Design a protein around this ligand. Structure first.
Ligand SMILES: *[C@@H]1O[C@H](CO)[C@@H](O[C@@H]2O[C@H](CO)[C@@H](O[C@@H]3O[C@H](CO[C@H]4O[C@H](CO[C@H]5O[C@H](CO)[C@@H](O)[C@H](O)[C@@H]5O)[C@@H](O)[C@H](O[C@H]5O[C@H](CO)[C@@H](O)[C@H](O)[C@@H]5O)[C@@H]4O)[C@@H](O)[C@H](O[C@H]4O[C@H](CO)[C@@H](O)[C@H](O)[C@@H]4O)[C@@H]3O)[C@H](O)[C@H]2NC(C)=O)[C@H](O)[C@H]1NC(C)=O
Ligand SMILES: *[C@@H]1O[C@H](CO)[C@@H](O[C@@H]2O[C@H](CO)[C@@H](O[C@@H]3O[C@H](CO)[C@@H](O)[C@H](O)[C@@H]3O)[C@H](O)[C@H]2NC(C)=O)[C@H](O)[C@H]1NC(C)=O
Ligand SMILES: *[C@@H]1O[C@H](CO)[C@@H](O[C@@H]2O[C@H](CO)[C@@H](O)[C@H](O)[C@H]2NC(C)=O)[C@H](O)[C@H]1NC(C)=O
Ligand SMILES: *[C@@H]1O[C@H](CO)[C@@H](O)[C@H](O)[C@H]1NC(C)=O
Ligand SMILES: [Cu+2]
Ligand SMILES: [Cu+2]
Ligand SMILES: [Cu+2]
Length: 499
């Protein structure tokens, strides 16, 4: 792991995670990027060095630290043209923030256009020396992070606008495509008799994955950085950008067991060892598993997840029993997505910079129709009714700057105002099911926060809005460093081909 104080150098480089060589955006020479780690309470000073030279994958960059509240450091949140102008090539930019009140599994990724699909993404763990789940496991380290990524042979700006699946699912940076049946698989080592806290992070740009491990059950103890009660499952459907910690007890026979991550579309299944990695017990031969997948009899259901500690749902136990309720009506016209009639187009002046320059109302803030001003210290309910008008479901939505209660989950008609899980990325389900996924949060974090589909190609097509929270306190609460103030003039000074 690198961090909490570290350089992250961004370059273009040839990679071959599935035996197919292609130029990609890499972090400290690798994609997925290295694990960044620290402890609860730490100040992170992540110096992002932009040494990119390839305009097609973008020479500029901006990095989001996914899941962190960024209270008082909204300028460091990442979304290009919401919280900063991008970092320019040949420049560095210091993200400097604290994590006083969170611990769990996170990740970092480019939040500029579709650049994270081209490889700028990696895991991020904040450890708790007093973790309430510590007694459930023996090992929790760099080697118990499991990343899932969709991998494309054609670059994000060069392929279809909305790809119909990846060429390969990568598990810990490796996996197979049909073009190379013998590409090196990832191996995750376990010692028989030891218990492992596996931190499963979806770095996916698009597909979700149904994760399971042959012959082993899993005990979920964390959901998007929120400690949960232990939930035993035998498979996990994980959506783009979500995280789970699960405990695996390595108490089976010394052997090789298939790790499976089946995408919802693309090359589905396991022919030739695609969508697979290897769980290898110390002492097992260095060969492929020959284990068989068994039917999931205890799949994860989100409604079965509950916080480990008592966590009150904002507002009052009835539909709309909050200070402010907002419904998000989805539309799509073939190239662009819309929320409540507006397709998001990034403004010239980042939303935070607009607020710093005086714009405090929806009327003054750009882009018009995409910014929702929220009152301070208020309960907010947002519903995302699934509709056929918005193809590419299930759409996992992410709210920046907050965790939220999932009062109603996908595939459920129940509203849980008592003990629902809190998380930061939620599937908005499908119209076939009549889904109306509904979340609640409190506004105790002044700043503009992006709320968007985390299928990166959909974000790109405008599937996003901004929650402009407590605009009158934003400037005072979020003092910006000189380096941040320098970003926009430097970016705006660039030749378009240097962007
Ligand atoms: C900036 O970034 C962008 C986006 O990433 C990047 O864009 C690439 O742009 C190029 C040119 O337009 C695109 O090129 C196409 O690339 C196709 C895929 O090539 C791969 O496969 C090649 C063939 O593979 C086989 O053979 C080898 C050995 O013989 C074997 O190992 C394999 O198993 C397999 O059997 C392979 O040669 C190639 O490897 C080269 O390129 C990579 C990438 O850098 C490099 O790492 C290697 O060192 C090596 O140089 C690669 O693995 C290719 O099929 C295609 O060629 C056909 O189409 C053209 C159409 O014009 C025909 O005219 C031509 O005759 C071929 O039939 C073409 O070359 C590429 O797809 C884009 N990349 C992506 C990811 O979208 C820019 O290049 C970047 N800028 C800079 C300066 O790097
Ligand atoms: C993972 O969790 C699953 C679900 O809880 C466990 O499955 C249960 O496993 C036992 C086998 O150990 C099954 O019961 C046995 O069935 C056989 C054959 O029918 C019978 O001969 C035995 O007397 C015994 O009753 C049980 O049916 C099964 N439950 C299911 C599938 O719903 C599984 O064992 C757990 N795996 C591990 C590695 O702990
Ligand atoms: C999804 O849930 C939302 C929030 O409850 C529903 O929106 C409300 O609908 C009623 C009509 O029954 C209106 O009076 C309210 O103003 C709506 N709330 C808003 C706009 O915040 C919505 O209809 C549900 N959608 C589906 C498809 O069930
Ligand atoms: C969809 O709407 C966008 C934004 O309003 C517009 O630019 C585009 O031409 C439309 N696309 C199609 C395929 O009709
Ligand atoms: Cu994210
Ligand atoms: Cu989407
Ligand atoms: Cu985001």
């Amino acid at each position: 792991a690198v961090g909490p104080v570290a350089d992250l150098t961004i370059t273009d480089a040839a990679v071959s995670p599935d035996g197919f060589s292609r130029q990609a955006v890499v972090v400290n020479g690798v994609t997925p990027g290295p694990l960044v780690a620290g402890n609860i309470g730490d100040r992170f000073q992540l110096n992002v060095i932009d040494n990119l030279t390839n305009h097609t994958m973008l020479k500029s960059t901006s990095i989001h630290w996914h899941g962190f509240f960024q209270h008082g450091t909204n300028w460091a949140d990442g979304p290009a043209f919401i919280n900063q102008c991008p970092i320019s090539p040949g420049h560095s930019f210091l993200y400097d923030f604290q994590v006083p009140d969170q611990a769990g599994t996170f990740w970092y990724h480019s939040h500029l256009s579709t650049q994270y699909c081209d490889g700028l993404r990696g895991p991020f763990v904040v450890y708790d020396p007093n973790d309430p789940h510590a007694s459930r496991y023996d090992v929790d380290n760099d080697d118990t992070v499991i990343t899932l990524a969709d991998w494309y042979h054609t670059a994000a700006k060069l392929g279809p606008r909305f790809p119909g699946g990846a060429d390969a699912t990568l598990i810990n940076g490796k996996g197979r495509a049909p073009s190379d049946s013998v590409a090196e698989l990832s191996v995750i080592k376990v010692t028989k008799g030891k218990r492992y806290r596996f931190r499963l992070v979806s770095l996916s740009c698009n597909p979700n994955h149904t994760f399971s491990i042959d012959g082993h059950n899993l005990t979920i103890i964390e959901v998007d950085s929120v400690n949960s009660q232990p939930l035993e499952v035998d498979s996990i459907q994980i959506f783009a950008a979500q995280r789970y910690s699960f405990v695996l007890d390595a108490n089976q026979a010394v052997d090789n067991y298939w790790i499976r991550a089946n995408p919802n579309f693309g090359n589905v299944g396991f022919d030739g060892g695609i969508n697979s990695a290897i769980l290898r017990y110390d002492g097992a031969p260095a060969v492929e598993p020959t284990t068989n997948q068994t039917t999931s009899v205890k799949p994860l259901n989100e409604v079965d997840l509950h916080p480990l500690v008592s966590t009150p749902v904002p507002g009052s136990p009835s539909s709309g029993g909050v200070d402010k309720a907002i419904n998000m009506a989805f539309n799509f016209n073939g190239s662009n997505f819309f929320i409540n009639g507006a397709s998001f187009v990034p403004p010239t002046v980042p939303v935070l910079l607009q607020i710093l320059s005086g714009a405090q109302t929806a009327q003054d803030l750009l882009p018009s129709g995409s910014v929702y001003v929220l009152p301070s210290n208020a309960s907010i309910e947002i519903s995302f009714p699934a509709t056929a008008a918005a193809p590419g479901a299930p759409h996992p939505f992410h709210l920046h700057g907050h965790t939220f209660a999932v009062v109603r989950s996908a595939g459920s008609t129940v509203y849980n105002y008592d003990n629902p899980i809190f998380r930061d990325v939620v599937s908005t389900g499908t119209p076939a099911a009549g889904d109306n996924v509904t979340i609640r949060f409190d506004t105790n974090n002044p700043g503009p926060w992006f709320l968007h589909c985390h299928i990166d190609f959909h974000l790109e097509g405008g599937f996003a809005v901004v929650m402009a929270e407590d605009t009158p306190d934003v400037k005072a609460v979020n003092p910006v460093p000189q380096a941040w103030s320098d970003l926009c003039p430097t970016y705006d000074a660039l030749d378009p081909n240097d962007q």
